[PDB]
Amino acid sequence: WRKWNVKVNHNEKRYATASAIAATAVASLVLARGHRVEKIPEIPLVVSTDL
Amino acid sequence: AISKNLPILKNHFRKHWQERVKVHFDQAGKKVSRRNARATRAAKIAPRPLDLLRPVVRAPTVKYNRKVRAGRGFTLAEVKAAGLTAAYARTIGIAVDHRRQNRNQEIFDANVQRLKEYQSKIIVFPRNGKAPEAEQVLSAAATFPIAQPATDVEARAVQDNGESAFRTLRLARSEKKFRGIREKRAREKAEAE
């Protein structure tokens, strides 16, 4: 009966996921964070819907 | 073990509590099964819904009479009135209830009318075992959403005959309180030979 799971505020979860999303633009970060994007078209990467 | 300016807490862990401790580790593993076992019913129970038609019903006590909430079953009265014997209407996925009683017209009719809309928006199949497959709406009470009944307009003319409301509340208050004492002052009033 340890406290295993955590209650996170439903609204932060968003502000978090949102913030998380905004950075998957931001060249520098994606780069900084692993990810060989050293030379992809433009950030964000948008491929065809045919994918 | 009294110290500092804290509240006085009353935590009841003096029995052998470590023994009866229900962690719901299986919260997930119950949803799933519940889902899994609802689906099998829909599947089994043919093109029928999962629920029965429940009636409106106004809720008890001071607190909750404001609003009107789904019911138990429909009362031999409503049932009859929308033109079916219960015994049958129990096989048409309606909920009946010999215990509820009808003392409210507005609420009566609502039900009996709500009873109409059902017989309408359904279909029964023949006996014959000839299954003309139709496809199931899952939830009767999804299709027939019990709603709150509006009781006025948004705007109207102001009607001030002048009488405080307050004081007619204050007064009604009195009237009840001395209802008894007044009544003895007539009994006693009549006692005068």
């Binding site: - | 001071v62 009479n65 009265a77 009683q101 009808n102 003392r103 409210n104 017209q105 507005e106 009566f108 007619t168 509340l169 009604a172 208050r173 009237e175 009840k176 209802r179």
Partner: protein
Amino acid sequence: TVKTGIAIGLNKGKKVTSMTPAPKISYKKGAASNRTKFVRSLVREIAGLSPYERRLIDLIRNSGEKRARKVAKKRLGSFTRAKAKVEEMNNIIAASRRH
């Protein structure tokens, strides 16, 4: 009823156009019948009065309904049945020995 319409008063409550429903018989579980009237009155005459019942009727003759109530109020459950019980007697009295 018809309610005042206000939330305290000598007939509190929201006003509604009323309905009054057909009645239950489970609301007559007490009520007599002519069967049970016969069977009960008849079994009486066979089996008769019991120990207290005897001394109850005599109490009523030689000591009014006041001592008879109070007496039987200790014999039986309590006061109200004691009351209805002495009743039964003035009748068994009036019945036979009287009119």
